[PDB]
């Protein structure tokens, strides 16, 4: 199956997922000079006060922190979005070195990592139906740079030793995703896709302009995870990012003047 190595990485995905060469693939480079302020964007509302985290899972590609999405609890609304989008999971992409790891780039700059908070449009009833729709998903993307530690990330870091290999999971209740946000909600937005197979073109991307800072020690612990399963040859889970894809017939809009 697909992965990030030389033999199954992003340059091979199109052979099983032909939409990889589609018209609104993600990630993209965000040219900050060409991005235009959009006065039609409504205020963005990140409403995570009642979030119910459940579990953390190494899926062989990243680790997911999963949420109860059986009711309207942690939701994302406003901005470019029509209606209510429910948080289902978050995960990260990161590099082998601090100079790479993000999926989106900003004027071609690569950050050390990128956080994706994944939400589905409640009008479609379930995530599976949402990924059949052009406006089925909204992903809130947040860049990570290396500097001071992010206190709200530390609980994640300290559980990773218990999910080292593909297929392992652990309880992860009572985690507040609000501790992963920067101060500002200024953002760029554009229509795109999932950045992993099946690469479905269902996503409204909302990428925050302000990175969060994490410590070197925090990201070094991400890089101790394994792509492989228990008992298999160790393959460090690093460089699990897709490079920027062609913008094609899209514009990136900014929430800020
Ligand atoms: O425990 C993590 C979070 O869970 C939510 O359900 C609560 O409303 C928050 O106050 C809390 O920070
Ligand atoms: O025709 C003019 C319009 O062109 C579009 O490509 C831009 O997104 C709009 O902001 C602009 O008003
Ligand atoms: O909040 C996420 C997790 O953080 C820490 O690991 C706590 O020990 C655990 O009880 C909790 O589930
Ligand atoms: N197309 S892909 O899923 O990346 C893939 C690449 C190489 C394989 F051997 C099998 C699958
Ligand atoms: N990496 S991402 O675009 O946020 C993504 C989110 C949900 C998926 F099911 C697959 C990929
Ligand atoms: Zn992602």
Curated annotation (Swiss-Prot):
This is Carbonic anhydrase 2. Changing residue 91 to Y: In OPTB3; partial loss of activity. Gene3D superfamilies: Alpha carbonic anhydrase (3.10.200.10). InterPro entries: CA_dom (IPR001148), CA_dom_sf (IPR036398), Carbonic_anhydrase_a-class (IPR023561), Carbonic_anhydrase_a-class_CS (IPR018338). Changing residue 194 to A: Reduced CO(2) hydrase activity. It is linked to Osteopetrosis, autosomal recessive 3: A rare genetic disease characterized by abnormally dense bone, due to defective resorption of immature bone. Osteopetrosis occurs in two forms: a severe autosomal recessive form occurring in utero, infancy, or childhood, and a benign autosomal dominant form occurring in adolescence or adulthood. Recessive osteopetrosis commonly manifests in early infancy with macrocephaly, feeding difficulties, evolving blindness and deafness, bone marrow failure, severe anemia, and hepatosplenomegaly. GO terms for biological process: angiotensin-activated signaling pathway; carbon dioxide transport; morphogenesis of an epithelium; neuron cellular homeostasis; positive regulation of cellular pH reduction; positive regulation of dipeptide transmembrane transport; positive regulation of synaptic transmission, GABAergic; regulation of chloride transport. The keyword Phosphoprotein applies. The active site is at residue 61. It comes from the Eukaryota. Catalyzes the reversible hydration of carbon dioxide. Can also hydrate cyanamide to urea. Stimulates the chloride-bicarbonate exchange activity of SLC26A6. Essential for bone resorption and osteoclast differentiation. Involved in the regulation of fluid secretion into the anterior chamber of the eye. Contributes to intracellular pH regulation in the duodenal upper villous epithelium during proton-coupled peptide absorption. Changing residue 64 to L: Reduced activity. Changing residue 59 to D: Strongly reduced activity. The record marks 89 as: Involved in the binding of some activators, including histamine and L-histidine. Changing residue 61 to A: Reduced CO(2) hydrase activity, rescued by 4-methylimidazole (4-MI). Reduced proton transfer. Enhanced proton transfer. Enhanced proton transfer capacity. The lineage of its organism: Eukaryota, Metazoa, Chordata, Craniata, Vertebrata. Residues 1-256 form the Alpha-carbonic anhydrase domain. Its cofactor is Zn(2+); Co(2+). It comes from Homo sapiens. Changing residue 116 to D/N/Q: Reduced activity. The keyword Cell wall biogenesis/degradation does not apply. SMART domains: Carb_anhydrase. Changing residue 194 to F: Normal activity. One of its GO terms (molecular function) is cyanamide hydratase activity.
């Amino acid at each position: 199956h697909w992965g990030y190595g030389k033999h199954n990485g992003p340059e091979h995905w199109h052979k099983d997922f032909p939409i990889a060469k589609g018209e609104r693939q993600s990630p993209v480079d965000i040219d900050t000079h060409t991005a235009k302020y959009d006065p039609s964007l409504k205020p963005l509302s990140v409403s995570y006060d009642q979030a119910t985290s459940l579990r953390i899972l190494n899926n062989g590609h990243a680790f997911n922190v999963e949420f109860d999405d059986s009711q309207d609890k942690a939701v994302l609304k406003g901005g470019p979005l029509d209606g209510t989008y429910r948080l289902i999971q978050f995960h990260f992409h990161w590099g082998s070195l601090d100079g790479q790891g993000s999926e989106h780039t900003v004027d071609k700059k690569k950050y050390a990592a990128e956080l994706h908070l994944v939400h589905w449009n409640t009008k479609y009833g379930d995530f599976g139906k949402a990924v059949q729709q052009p406006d089925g998903l909204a992903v809130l993307g947040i860049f990570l740079k290396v500097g001071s530690a992010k206190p709200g990330l530390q609980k994640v870091v300290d559980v990773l030793d218990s999910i080292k290999t593909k297929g392992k999971s652990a309880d992860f209740t009572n985690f507040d995703p609000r501790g992963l946000l920067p101060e500002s909600l200024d953002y760029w937005t554009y229509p795109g896709s999932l950045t992993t197979p099946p690469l479905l073109e269902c996503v409204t991307w909302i990428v925050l302009k302000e990175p969060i800072s994490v410590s070197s020690e925090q990201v070094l612990k991400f890089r101790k995870l394994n792509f492989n399963g228990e008992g298999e040859p160790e393959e460090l889970m690093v460089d699990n990012w897709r490079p920027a894809q062609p913008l094609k017939n899209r514009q990136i809009k900014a929430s800020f003047k």
